[PDB]
Amino acid sequence: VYPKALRDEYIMSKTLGSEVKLAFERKTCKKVAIKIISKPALNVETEIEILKKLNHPCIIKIKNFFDAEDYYIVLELMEGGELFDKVVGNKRLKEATCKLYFYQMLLAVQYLHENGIIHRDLKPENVLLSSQEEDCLIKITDFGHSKILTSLMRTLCGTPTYLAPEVLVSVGTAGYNRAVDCWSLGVILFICLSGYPPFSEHRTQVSLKDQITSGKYNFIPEVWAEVSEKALDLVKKLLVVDPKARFTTEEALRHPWLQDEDMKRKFQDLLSEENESTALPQVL
Ligand SMILES: COc1cc(-c2cnc(N)c(-c3ccc(C(N)=O)cc3)c2)ccc1O
């Protein structure tokens, strides 16, 4: 059974994932999502400490937290469910929709990056859709694995006299960890546009570690011929092996594919519409 303190504010309903439960807030009769996590502590102390501090349309907000036998985390409820469900089993979203979704993905991740945060676990199932409309807001979720951006920094201005070699060498590449969420975005954009994974083991004898390190991804021109060159061009620039050359969230946001005033207009429209709920009258 659930804590008295939890049951006291919420009315636990059905299951949504596995675990995430649906619940109603007593005060308001509004639907919320409650994530349960059994005992560990580190990932949560931080996911909360992060979520609490974050503030963006395309990042999931935390509504409440319960430290008990297990951990209960109360979040905004995304009604469209996971993005994974939209692409699983070679389903595929129309390009215009991918641009819409990916644009928000870029905004969200750029946001984290501006704030010294690295998600590190971006997958189709950590992206949630605000409704069942395929014209909806998406939100990034699952900050369990996030890093937060100085060891080297200090080590640097000192006596390199005893400093091991490997550490100085580590400098050239230091400070580029975020590049890994851009990889992941790349992988995601691929699956979305095509229907299929860039590096799977379906019909191929080359290892998976080797497809990825090489950069050589299963490219099936039959499916891709349906997809624009502008789109695919971007996928290519995110799936760069060298992280220093890889596209950043910003370079991606400046890419031709994303200079599309309609998709941006639709996102606007979509934005304000969510905000009508909270719209405070303001000074004129
Ligand atoms: C179609 O209905 C479904 C909804 C959900 C669902 C709805 N809202 C959410 N906030 C979440 C959710 C997903 C991931 C996490 C995380 N990993 O921390 C937290 C909350 C899920 C899921 C399936 C559905 O069929």
Every domain of the chain with CATH number 1.10.510.10 lies at 78-284
Q: Cβ contacts of residue 61 below 8 Å, gap of 6+?
A: 51, 54, 75, 76
Experimental method: X-ray
What's the token pair of residue 17?
């994932």
Contact 140, 108 (CB under 8 A): yes
What's the token pair of residue 115?
């704030």
* Residues with catalytic roles: 121
Mutate which of 16, 59, 71, 75 to test ligand 1's pocket (most atoms within 8 Å of Cβ)? 16
| Known binding positions | 17-20, 35, 76-82, 125-126, 142
Element (H, E) at 171: none
DSSP state of 123: -
For ligand 1, whether the C-beta of 128 sits within 6 Å is: yes
DSSP state of 86: G
Q: Is 228 exposed, middle or buried (0-12, 13-18, 19+ CB in 10 A)?
A: middle
Cα torsion 5, 8, 10, 14: sign: positive
| CATH code that applies to domain 1-77 | 3.30.200.20
Q: Cβ contacts of residue 36 below 8 Å, gap of 6+?
A: 19, 20, 21, 70, 71, 72, 73
CA distance 211 to 114: 31
For ligand 1, whether the C-beta of 82 sits within 6 Å is: yes
Q: Strand 30-38 relative to strand 20-25: parallel, antiparallel, unpaired?
A: antiparallel
| Known binding positions for ATP | 17-20, 35, 76-82, 125-126, 142
- Which amino acid, 67? D
Every domain of the chain with CATH number 3.30.200.20 lies at 1-77
CA distance 127 to 212: 22
| CATH code that applies to domain 78-284 | 1.10.510.10
Contact 104, 135 (CB under 8 A): no
**How is 213-265 classified by DSSP, letter by letter?**
HH------HHHHTTS-HHHHHHHHHHS-SSTTTSPPHHHHHTSGGG--HHHHH
For ligand 1, whether the C-beta of 86 sits within 6 Å is: no
The beta strand positions in 54-126, using DSSP E, are 62-67, 70-75, 81-82, 117-118
How far, in Å, are 99, 178, 249 from residue 181 at the CA level? 18, 6, 9
Helix/strand/coil percentages in the chain, nearest 5: 40, 15, 40
Ligand 1 atom closest to 85 (CA)? 25
For ligand 1, whether the C-beta of 36 sits within 6 Å is: no
Cα torsion 91, 198, 16, 54: sign: negative
